[PDB]
Design a protein around this nucleic acid. Sequence first.
DNA 1: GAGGACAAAGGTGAAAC
DNA 2: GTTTCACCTTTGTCCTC
Lengths: 76, 80
Amino acid sequence: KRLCLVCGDIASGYHYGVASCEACKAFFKRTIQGNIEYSCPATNECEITKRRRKSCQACRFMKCLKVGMLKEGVRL
Amino acid sequence: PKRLCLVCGDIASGYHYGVASCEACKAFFKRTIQGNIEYSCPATNECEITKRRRKSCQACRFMKCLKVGMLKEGVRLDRV
DNA sequence: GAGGACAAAGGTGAAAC
DNA sequence: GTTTCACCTTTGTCCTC
Ligand SMILES: [Zn+2]
Ligand SMILES: [Zn+2]
Ligand SMILES: [Zn+2]
Ligand SMILES: [Zn+2]
Ligand SMILES: [Zn+2]
């Protein structure tokens, strides 16, 4: 089953160049559209899992970038 | 269509934790579960819960939330 | 596979307690 | 010092395009 490369939830298909779920798709889209900056309250190593993806916006967004979600896939 | 809070009789803003409820009972239930807060009734666990008296007993207000069907599991452990 | 509508989650802080 | 609640923001679903 296609897994979301960000969080391990079931992927709905490719989004912004990468196998991802609707939740991570929507989160990445909002983050880019608003130029929203987050910062980790731990040390930028928060676990991102389907059951625990909302614990840190900063680490979730960094994981999106890491797995190859593309800023320019989001329309201005 | 106008809907009433099943807990206290205030105007409901929507469904919260599975039940028609106002913003106050939603917030109260959310705080209670997030903190695993235990309350105790000073009377005999039959305090009336109304718009005018929802503040008088945390214990009875929380038990009423459970009674009308508010769901502990609708409160996410996944948060900041 | 892009974005948007939107219910129902979540967070907040002045005022109430 | 802690708790309440009106008014916010964010999340994730499901839909048109
Ligand atoms: Zn399989
Ligand atoms: Zn995901
Ligand atoms: Zn973090
Ligand atoms: Zn209520
Ligand atoms: Zn009581």
